[PDB]
Amino acid sequence: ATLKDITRRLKSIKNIQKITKSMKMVAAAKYARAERELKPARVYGVGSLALYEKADIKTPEDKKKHLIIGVSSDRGLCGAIHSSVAKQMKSEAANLAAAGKEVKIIGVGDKIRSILHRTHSDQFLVTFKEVGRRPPTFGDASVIALELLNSGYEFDEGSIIFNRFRSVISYKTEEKPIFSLDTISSAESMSIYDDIDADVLRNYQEYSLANIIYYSLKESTTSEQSARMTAMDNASKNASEMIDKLTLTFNRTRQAVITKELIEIISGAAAL
Amino acid sequence: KLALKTIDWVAFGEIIPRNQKAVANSLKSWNETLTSRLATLPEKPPAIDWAYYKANVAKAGLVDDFEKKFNALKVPIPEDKYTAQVDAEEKEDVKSCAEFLTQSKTRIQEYEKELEKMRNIIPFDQMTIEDLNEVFPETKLDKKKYPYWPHRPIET
């Protein structure tokens, strides 16, 4: 292009690089805070899951009602977080509906809703937004579980998909089964547990639902902040490479413009 | 020559069974292409100026012979053999007016008969189990399967 085109492009890319560096720093701070908070929540959620892996529960094979919950967020710029979550969610939904089930979907965060608003647009039991602005608490998990139980879609099985946070650079997508009391009562393993009517067990199921939602929220926010930090680092690096190339081009163009104007002056002077 | 009968289309779309829309749409499209071609083709073939064409040719006789052969010789025209679909109309005259019309009218008549028979009945405040037995045979507790009281299954 001309010199002004190159100058404007170079200025824009420099601004973009500045912004992405600042966003990397912010994401890194929030990641440190979220990891610090994730440790206790990690132990708490693992303890809450304890039972189902201590007294193995096999879901009933005669039921059709299923729930898919997908934890993510509203923020973008986090790489393949929302993408992975929604991809596995639709994989599971297709598998269930092929095996013959009545699946619904709950989306914690806009981006899941958006990714799944073209297909599975009618299975949305309910979706939550305003995720990611502030670190998730137990209040959020309690609200999600409460609005799930209140919405009278008494499900017969459940799954939750979130991005388990492995390392600062890597994360994994998990599926954690969620059972209803119809399955817990009808389990030979549960015969041993003492003082187990069908009301204390129901309250326990509600609380465990809130617990698993909270665990998924903490893991998901940790992994999302880590991914945003990584994505911003890569974006800043790419902006730096582009800035180098454009600076070289700008220097070439500036010198060429100087030479061109000077040759015009010389030709005019010698052509008198 | 041309004075084509007008067609409504929202009405045309009201009389095609699901098994037949695959030919209705093709007929629509092929009518469309024919209409576009007819519009493209002119109202008349352009006139000719035979005088000038004969006035710039050394062998005026040959072009005069061309002109005269043109004057004598005309062109042929197609007919209605491909239009044998004539017959189809007669067949319809049976369904929509003899078979479908008559059967539909008989069903209609039965439906009124039922309608007034159902509308003309005594207020329930005086009626009896027998009344519901006649008017509604669905209340008859078939003794052919449930003899002993309460006839209606105990599990209900």
Binding site: T7, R8, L10, S12, T247 | -
Partner: protein, 47 residues
């Protein structure tokens, strides 16, 4: 060679149009919400 504020939308490249649209959609939504509230206030204050 330096950079200055409000340069992303001075270039008018792809980021410029993307930012313009990201702004316009949001403020169209908020204008719709505010207009609804204005109509509600009108009706509730007629009396």
């Amino acid at each position: 060679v330096r950079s200055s504020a409000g340069a992303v939308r001075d270039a008018g490249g792809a980021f410029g149009k993307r930012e313009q649209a990201e702004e316009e959609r949001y403020f169209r939504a908020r204008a719709k919400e505010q207009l609804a509230a204005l109509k509600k206030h009108h009706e509730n204050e007629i009396s």
